[PDB]
């Protein structure tokens, strides 16, 4: 019973020379561009802002040069594409791990907003990035994944136990109430803060607004406050019936998916999806990049 089931083992992904942010992934987003084609950007430099969500910043995952600003019907921002070059970056304050749970909420927000990592959060429902002036009594951490062919979160978190817990400690200070780690039964490194809860699930077989953030973005939150640098590493499941060796591969936020799957694939006509067949983007043309909230890439036969 495989049908493209990934080996839950991490290895290096194929080389990535360009990345993008995808404008249509952010509910209600109406962009104001802060770069144009030809601009050089640092990692964590702002590429655009949302007119309908003032103060939220959408920042570059890499140092490089803006090579494409793709727009569709009614001029919607499809993608801002950055060709990797150099290692320039905006840096932020760093802290000892023992200080994180005691930081002030407003300083936490400012660092998350300024770095762009604030976009990791989405409200429930509406699925919008929270307003920067808002708070939540309930931050949910998704440390499980029910999508077919997803990466097992425990395997990823095991490489990054310190940063995962550090991220939970930051969230424990950010929430006005509790943090809820949604997980399968398998044990995980545990925050020591009393308002971080675990919610254990098993499956599948086969204002009062909560926020949600996935476990890889929690690792990124811990790295941001421990090191002062935006942490753009991703571990994604590369899987599907036409993937020769489905497995977990290291890549970067926003990675070119044409470059990521370069001869990982059996011959024939195939379709690349950022995310899963249940929740994904057809990764073609200006959309052929890893979506902000996607932790897997599915490649399937065409018919």
UniProtKB/Swiss-Prot annotation:
What EC number(s) are associated with this protein in UniProt?
7.2.1.1
| UniProt-recorded Gene Ontology molecular function terms | oxidoreductase activity, acting on NAD(P)H, quinone or similar compound as acceptor
Q: Does the keyword NAD apply?
A: yes
Provide the reaction this enzyme catalyses: a ubiquinone + n Na(+)(in) + NADH + H(+) = a ubiquinol + n Na(+)(out) + NAD(+)
For this chain's UniProt record, which GO biological process terms are given? sodium ion transport
Sorted keywords for this record are:
Ion transport, NAD, Sodium, Sodium transport, Translocase, Transport, Ubiquinone
Note whether Translocase occurs among the keywords: yes
What's the superkingdom here? Bacteria
Self-association and partners: Composed of six subunits; NqrA, NqrB, NqrC, NqrD, NqrE and NqrF.
What family classification does the UniProt entry report for this protein?
Belongs to the NqrA family.
Q: What does this protein do?
A: NQR complex catalyzes the reduction of ubiquinone-1 to ubiquinol by two successive reactions, coupled with the transport of Na(+) ions from the cytoplasm to the periplasm. NqrA to NqrE are probably involved in the second step, the conversion of ubisemiquinone to ubiquinol.
The molecule here is called: Na(+)-translocating NADH-quinone reductase subunit A
- Record organism: Vibrio cholerae serotype O1 (strain ATCC 39315 / El Tor Inaba N16961)
Covered residues of the complete protein?
11 to 329 of 446
